[PDB]
Amino acid sequence: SLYGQQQAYAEPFIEMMDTNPEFRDKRSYMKNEHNLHDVLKKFGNNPILNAIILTRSNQVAMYCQPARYSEKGLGFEVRLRDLDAEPGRKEKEEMKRIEDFIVNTGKDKDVDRDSFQTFCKKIVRDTYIYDQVNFEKVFNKNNKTKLEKFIAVDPSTIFYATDKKGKIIKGGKRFVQVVDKRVVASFTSRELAMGIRNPRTELSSSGYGLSEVEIAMKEFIAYNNTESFNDRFFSHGGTTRGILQIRSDQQQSQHALENFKREWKSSLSGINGSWQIPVVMADDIKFVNMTPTANDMQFEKWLNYLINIISALYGIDPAEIGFPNRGGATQQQSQNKGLQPLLRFIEDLVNRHIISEYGDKYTFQFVGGDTKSATDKLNILKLETQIFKTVNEAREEQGKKPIEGGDIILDASFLQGTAQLQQDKQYNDGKQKERLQMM
Amino acid sequence: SLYGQQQAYAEPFIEMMDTNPEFRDKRSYMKNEHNLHDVLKKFGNNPILNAIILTRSNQVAMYCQPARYSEKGLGFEVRLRDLDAEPGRKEKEEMKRIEDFIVNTGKDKDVDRDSFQTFCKKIVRDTYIYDQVNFEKVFNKNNKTKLEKFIAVDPSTIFYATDKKGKIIKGGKRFVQVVDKRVVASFTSRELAMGIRNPRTELSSSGYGLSEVEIAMKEFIAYNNTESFNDRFFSHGGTTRGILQIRSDQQQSQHALENFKREWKSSLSGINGSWQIPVVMADDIKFVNMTPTANDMQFEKWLNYLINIISALYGIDPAEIGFPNRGGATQQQSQNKGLQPLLRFIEDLVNRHIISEYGDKYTFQFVGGDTKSATDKLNILKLETQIFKTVNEAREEQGKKPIEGGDIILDASFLQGTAQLQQDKQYNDGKQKERLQMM
Questions:
Q1: What is the C-alpha separation between A107 and A249, in angstroms, rounded?
Q2: Region for A8 from its dihedrals, namely left if φ exceeds 0, alpha if ψ lies in -120 to 50, beta otherwise
Q3: Rounded distance between C-alpha atoms, residue A400 and residue B376, angstroms
Q4: Side-chain half-sphere of A108: how many Cα atoms within 13 Å?
Q5: Could you say which of B54, B65, B280 has the minimum Cβ distance to residue A315?
Q6: Is the Cβ pair B382, A386 closer than 8 Å?
Q7: Is A244's CB within 8 Å of B277's CB?
Q8: Which of A18, A241, B195, B332 has a C-alpha 20 to 30 A away from that of A185?
Q9: B320 is in an annotated binding site
């Protein structure tokens, strides 16, 4: 049921007793807690995590515009599934309409609704915090077959529904929304998407993704309490430099000490009388140091290590978030592993969920920001054509029609060989005139 | 039986007594524990391991799209087994259908089922944690000969089945699924695949792969308890800076000490009165230090060594996971040893298990991300053609048909020699006219 009809089991044979029959709960890795997103919501406010989220969101936001409206190639585009297939006036108009629909996130403009930029900015946060993304579709009521609007829904409230036997359902309504432990609404598979970026095969998770926050929970709390320890020097006591002991047979009366303080403040306090030296005629005086000569941050390398491993979990370069790399440099490759997989994930999700409603012959893809790869591709072609490939063969290979002029291989020598062969060929073929002349 | 009919023994002659007759258990290397995947599941949650898994999964996810739908060459492709063999309209359509089938992981689209991207992301995790991968096939019920769907199954629940004599079976059902120590279902060899990345020949393992987690178990627990030791400075006591001793003939009453604390807090605590100096008139005062002047992380090099060897076991560069390389640099070659073998393993598995159902004449392979190797190949050809190879010979060599113009060797000098030879040849051959004229 979970994926379809199959011979094997890919779901827990025995249900979790404490869970409600109507749905299957999402739980921690070790089954330590049957309620996970509640504690992940607490870490949702962490600065380091939020810094990563915001950096990735800003990176994605640039790509979130259509290509044909952009003077430069950066953006997204819709095209026919086959690159070699020709376009058409009807299909071009349909693709333009679909692109405008995605840009406006609906059939018609509405200021009250999200632009696709904000939708992606929501999706990245939901992907990197909870590792679960969901968005609702609004099919036309006059015609169930077609689509009108689509918007995002928070993943924390959405669960997998279950049948009376407790097994996850396939047919009909499959996803259910829960608020304050009460069932509110449920959705058909087509009506609500489910994107999992970090899936797992073990029966315990039952298909729910694994979020990096759960993995780094210990590290996150360690970072938090380390920061608290550093800040408690100021927000709490212990900032004394030392104690000035004065030996005496009798402890001086508090009035005398107050007058002592008055004299000290009047003579030495502040910039006024800063450089002056007092004089005291007691038996013996000592100054005992309680703190070192100069203070500084503590456990610096510990923080660097923690943030480095946390960054490595998300695949982001620590240098972007203002920390040193414990190895390597101390950007293209960092971007290649960090951003491009996320863009491809969003691409696949949006494609297979939205474009399925219009037709198989179309697809959605991002474009731009990859000049170097295209440069190397063109260099491959430019080196290949010198010896191997004809101009017309390459042009046909890349979904274009040939140009008259012969299927020439571009080299100034090669042309002279063909020209010389043709010139001498015409000389030899001209001797057939003499051959017939004797007749 | 294990591999086929053979003269030698490649399975334990005497069965393990404590194992159930229905299947052969998978056990540790030293036979210390007869149950292994249970303890490996515990280490499945480790951050370092999960970081490696996620990095490799993100690396693989980029390649997991078809080539002909991608503007750039990165992706996968299906082609005829012989590169020199010509294509055809029928075969091209069949290959396109097969590629779409692999992309959708079934005969028809289904949102409820995994895309091949998520399938690969599952496979890498199962390959690097357990060193065992399995996926079920769903043949058409109306026709057993052909295939409809295929999906992944967790390797922890799957075992090798055994006969009444305890020997592993070849014919019929060979693989069995066990849940909570109960047999649930069993599968034919064609119906369920078995991929082993790190095989062994010793009879003790009986063909089961060896997982790197078992090898690094000691190192993993050492890393865990080292991290716990570092964190217990904050999560547990021992954070005192020192003790302020004040000598007195009598221990002061607790009321006096409380008033002492009140005065101290009122005068010195917090930012308020931070720079002030107290005064005390006791006989003698000391401050004894219990911790050093400045704290920092401990056993740093030990952690670096541990993570370096763990990374070397998996073949991943430590620099990717935010650690320094103890040798070398302190990326192409690291990728070449790390990623490409995994891609080739997935390639071989998918090929020999899926494409076998359609025909021998087809094959599945990845493509792209290897411009430098192709550049060197083209450079080999470009240097060879100057002296050695004709244009038409090379074109024939690479599964293409010749171009009219002669089998020329590309060098501006060589063409002049042929042209000069032909020009003088025609001069000499023209003297046959004079030879016949005298007749």
A1: 93
A2: beta
A3: 28
A4: 1
A5: B54
A6: yes
A7: yes
A8: A18
A9: no
Radius of gyration over every alpha carbon of chain A, rounded to an integer in angstroms: 36
Method: cryo-EM
Element (H, E) at B340: helix B340-354
Q: Which residues pair with B151 in a beta bridge?
A: B136
The CA distance from B73 to A378, in Å, is: 11
Q: What residue of A is the nearest CA neighbor of B411?
A: A413
Best A1, A2, A3 residue to mutate vs chain B (most B CBs within 10 Å): A3
Chain B: residue whose CA lies nearest to A81: B69
Picking from A37, A38, A65, A74, the residue whose alpha carbon sits closest to that of residue A369 is A74
Nearest chain A residue to B228, by CA: A218
- Which candidate from A245, A337, A421 shows the least CB-CB separation from B59? A337
B382: CB partners within 8 A, 6+ apart: A383, A386, A387
Backbone angles phi, psi at A328, to 5 degrees: 90, -110
Rounded CA separation B264/B22 (Å)? 76
B294 with A290: Cβ contact below 8 A: no
- Residue by residue, DSSP assigns B31-45 as SS-S--HHHHHHHTT
Q: Which of B211, B154, B197 is nearest to B179 (CA)?
A: B154
Interstrand relation of A158-161 and A147-153 (parallel, antiparallel or unpaired): unpaired
Top residue of A28, A76, A81, A201 to mutate, by most chain B CBs within 10 Å, is A201
Interface size A-B, in CB pairs within 8 Å, comes to 306
**Closest CB from A9, A257, A353 relative to B279:** A257
Closest CA to B225 of A218, A6, A51, A432: A218
Pairing of strands A132-139, A147-153: antiparallel
- DSSP letter, residue B296: -
Among the residues of B200-299, which ranges form H helices?
A: 212-215, 217-235, 254-268
- What span, in angstroms and rounded, lies between the C-alpha atoms of B17 and B20? 8
Q: Cα(A433)–Cα(A419) distance, rounded to whole angstroms? A: 22
Half-sphere exposure (Cβ direction) of B254: Cα atoms closer than 13 Å? 0
**Helical H runs in B137-242?**
212-215, 217-235
In whole angstroms, give the CA distance from residue B82 to residue B360: 11
CA distance A280 to A300: 43
- Min Cα separation B9/chain A (Å): 32
Which chain A residues have a beta carbon less than 8 Å from that of B115?
A: 348, 352
